[PDB]
Design a protein around this ligand. Structure first.
Ligand SMILES: *[C@@H]1O[C@H](CO)[C@@H](O[C@@H]2O[C@H](CO)[C@@H](O[C@@H]3O[C@H](CO[C@H]4O[C@H](CO)[C@@H](O)[C@H](O)[C@@H]4O)[C@@H](O)[C@H](O[C@H]4O[C@H](CO)[C@@H](O)[C@H](O)[C@@H]4O)[C@@H]3O)[C@H](O)[C@H]2NC(C)=O)[C@H](O)[C@H]1NC(C)=O
Ligand SMILES: *[C@@H]1O[C@H](CO)[C@@H](O[C@@H]2O[C@H](CO)[C@@H](O)[C@H](O)[C@H]2NC(C)=O)[C@H](O)[C@H]1NC(C)=O
Ligand SMILES: *[C@@H]1O[C@H](CO)[C@@H](O)[C@H](O)[C@H]1NC(C)=O
Ligand SMILES: *[C@@H]1O[C@H](CO)[C@@H](O)[C@H](O)[C@H]1NC(C)=O
Ligand SMILES: *[C@@H]1O[C@H](CO)[C@@H](O)[C@H](O)[C@H]1NC(C)=O
Ligand SMILES: *[C@@H]1O[C@H](CO)[C@@H](O)[C@H](O)[C@H]1NC(C)=O
Ligand SMILES: *[C@@H]1O[C@H](CO)[C@@H](O)[C@H](O)[C@H]1NC(C)=O
Length: 268
């Protein structure tokens, strides 16, 4: 389970089925994937040795996106999908582009980052709403079996990942736009000395600082929410979710900057 609130009994498989194969992809940083811009600094036409929260080059990304239709499997809400956060994670996220009457809609998996996922603890939630990225850190009563839905194409079940009837206590609540036409988003989520840090990119690969948030507590877990949809399948549109995640750690990189100060290359 994620949280411990019984939000629903509708269409749950508690059967000990085959675990879905988590797909894996090698981390290659040679074009600046997994890197970020340093503070308020510009570096031009140069190489820098810098120690930062970076992926291990040659480690694996895991695709933790889960697309459902009606049934939720209880095995989705366990290890290996429920994952240790440690220092942090780098996300490579497919922007799943869907069309309704030729109008573009942007979907991708919500991620939750927390400890115990109960309403005496803060859970960070990063959720897309079609070009708006809603980021919150609140005392959510997370569901046992949380998921999101396609708002665009609809779903056979309602969205429920928390059950707060009155507004929960929040440390953070901000919206960030992202470019809905992009094919990929990139995120760093990490923690240092009781403070959470987020970086993102929607164009190119090297991320930029979004925000930081003092928590005063260690985050221990993250989970990529299942998304349920009538579409995003071989019998509808041949679209897919992808939410690739790999651990961060304090690593020395060589960073190469071009004459615009873009990180064009990196070495672990
Ligand atoms: C912070 O987050 C916590 C979870 O970590 C929330 O606490 C849970 O809140 C729910 C909702 O109030 C509690 O569930 C309800 O418990 C009642 C009491 O349970 C006893 O009695 C029943 C028989 O009635 C026994 O079966 C059971 O074993 C216990 O002995 C139940 O009466 C409720 O059931 C009724 O309402 C539901 C509504 O969906 C109906 O489906 C049922 O048919 C029935 O009519 C219900 O089960 C839960 O027990 C709490 N857990 C804990 C650990 O406390 C907090 O509410 C939340 N707080 C805030 C401010 O967000
Ligand atoms: C951040 O973006 C979300 C999603 O657009 C906003 O939430 C919606 O706000 C309207 C107006 O209050 C409600 O009618 C909707 O029900 C809300 N939810 C959704 C999923 O659309 C939110 O208001 C924005 N602003 C802030 C500060 O969070
Ligand atoms: C969850 O709540 C529903 C509604 O009361 C109930 O039918 C179901 O048995 C509950 N499941 C568990 C595991 O408690
Ligand atoms: C960038 O650096 C190279 C190597 O020193 C140099 O040859 C080139 O002229 C520089 N270009 C600019 C635009 O500074
Ligand atoms: C979805 O929510 C509506 C409104 O509360 C309700 O009528 C409907 O039965 C719900 N469906 C499911 C599958 O939860
Ligand atoms: C959005 O992304 C597309 C595809 O990468 C790009 O062509 C376009 O210029 C971007 N638009 C904005 C406003 O950045
Ligand atoms: C999805 O792709 C396969 C292979 O090209 C094709 O057989 C199938 O008809 C496609 N489905 C849709 C809904 O386009």
């Amino acid at each position: 389970v994620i949280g411990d609130f019984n939000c629903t009994n509708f269409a749950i498989n508690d059967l000990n089925t085959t675990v879905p194969r988590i797909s894996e992809y090698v981390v290659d940083v040679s074009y600046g994937l997994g890197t970020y811009y340093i503070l308020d600094r510009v570096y031009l036409n140069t190489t820098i040795l810098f120690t930062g929260y970076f992926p291990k080059s040659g480690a694996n990304f895991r695709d933790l996106s889960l697309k459902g239709t009606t049934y939720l499997s209880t095995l989705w809400y366990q290890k290996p999908f429920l994952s240790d956060f440690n220092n942090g994670i780098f996300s490579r996220v497919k922007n799943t582009k869907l069309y309704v009457n030729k109008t573009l809609y942007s979907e991708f998996s919500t991620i939750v980052i927390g400890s115990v996922f109960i309403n005496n603890s803060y859970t960070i939630v990063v959720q897309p709403h079609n070009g708006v990225l809603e980021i919150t850190a609140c005392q959510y009563t997370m569901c046992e079996y949380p998921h999101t839905i396609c708002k665009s194409k609809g779903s056979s079940r309602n969205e429920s990942w928390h059950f707060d009837k009155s507004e929960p206590l929040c440390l953070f609540k901000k919206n960030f736009t992202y470019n809905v036409s992009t094919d990929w988003l990139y995120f760093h989520f990490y923690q240092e000395r009781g403070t959470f840090y987020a970086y993102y990119a929607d164009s190119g690969m090297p991320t930029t600082f979004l925000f930081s948030l003092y928590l005063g507590t260690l985050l221990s877990h993250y989970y990529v929410l299942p998304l349920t949809c009538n579409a995003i399948s071989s019998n509808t549109d041949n679209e897919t979710l992808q939410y690739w995640v790999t651990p961060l750690s304090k690593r020395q990189y060589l960073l190469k900057f071009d004459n615009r100060g873009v990180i064009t290359n990196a070495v672990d």
